[PDB]
Structure 1
Amino acid sequence: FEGGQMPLFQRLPKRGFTNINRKEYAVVNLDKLNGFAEGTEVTPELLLE
């Protein structure tokens, strides 16, 4: 509140929307893989483990 001054959010506009079918994939950044042994397979199951 600002004492009857039109506050910031109202004087500003809305923008955009949200998707229902959004995918926020879990991200690995390729250096965390160096912790694994050579030639070993990799799976999300394994990573959760």
Structure 2
Amino acid sequence: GGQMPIHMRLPKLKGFKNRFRTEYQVVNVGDINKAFPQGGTVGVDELVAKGLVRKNSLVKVLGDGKLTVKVDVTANKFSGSAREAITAAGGSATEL
């Protein structure tokens, strides 16, 4: 109507974008537990086979659920909780 519009009378959101950001596709230990009842080696290939992460992305594993199986996980990155939860069930958190 003529007054200063809502998008012009408020401050712009602070910050910048950092185009060199490394973004990861994340998978939780609960999903791994559900999808791998028999355990076994777990890499990015089978993580995309069971439809858990995108095809050709970077995978980081997060420790949300509960892990109760012996599993040998390989991934780009691991969180502290996920690594501890994998190790406690007698598995190896191999980092690429």
Smaller-chain TM-score bracket? 0.7 to 0.9
2:68 equivalent in structure 1: none
* Unaligned ranges ≥5, structure 1: none
1:17 equivalent in structure 2: 16
Matching residue within 3, 6, 16 for 2:4: 6
* Unaligned ranges ≥5, structure 2: 50-96
Q: Could you tell me the TM-score, scaled by structure 1's length?
A: 0.74
1:43 equivalent in structure 2: 43
2:56 equivalent in structure 1: none
Across the two proteins, how many residue pairs are aligned to each other?
A: 46
Q: Could you tell me the TM-score, scaled by structure 2's length?
A: 0.43
Higher relative contact order (CA 8 A, sep 6+): 2
**Structure 1 stretches of 4+ moved >4 Å:** none
Identity %: 48
Larger strand share, 1 or 2: 2
AA in 1 matched with 2:10: L
The CA distance in 2 between the partners of 1:44 and 1:8, in whole Å, is 46
